[PDB]
Amino acid sequence: GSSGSSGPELKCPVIGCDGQGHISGKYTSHRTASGCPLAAKRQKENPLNGASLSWKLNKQELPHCPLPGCNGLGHVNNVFVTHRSLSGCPLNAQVIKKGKVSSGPSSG
Ligand SMILES: [Zn+2]
Numbered sequence: 001g002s003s004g005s006s007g008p009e010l011k012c013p014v015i016g017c018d019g020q021g022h023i024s025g026k027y028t029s030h031r032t033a034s035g036c037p038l039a040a041k042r043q044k045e046n047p048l049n050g051a052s053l054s055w056k057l058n059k060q061e062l063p064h065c066p067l068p069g070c071n072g073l074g075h076v077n078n079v080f081v082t083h084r085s086l087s088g089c090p091l092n093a094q095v096i097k098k099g100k101v102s103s104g105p106s107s108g
């Protein structure tokens with residue numbers, strides 16, 4: 001090895017993606033959307049494949065919170081870490097406020 005080599009190259013423009021793998025399968029990597037397997041997995045619905053740690057799991061379920069940003073995790077009483085309702089939603093309680101002078105109707 002007299003010398004090495006370096007240089008930037010294309011990359012998966014699809015945010016959130018890892019860039020690894022290929023919508024074809026043969027290749028275990030990609031740097032474009034056309035070859036992005038993740039971008040295809042979304043548009044399509046093939047739950048065929050899927051591995052999840054299902055064994056000896058007592059607490060296995062998702063919360064029931066209306067708030068989009070809220071991950072149904074937490075509690076107003078500041079005691080637990082879960083909540084499947086508003087009254088319990090800690091992020092919904094603080095928000096509560098009658099008389100919010102500042103009001104921005106504009107929606108972009
Ligand atoms: Zn990708």
Ligand SMILES: [Zn+2]
Binds near residue numbers: 066083
């Ligand atoms: Zn919540």
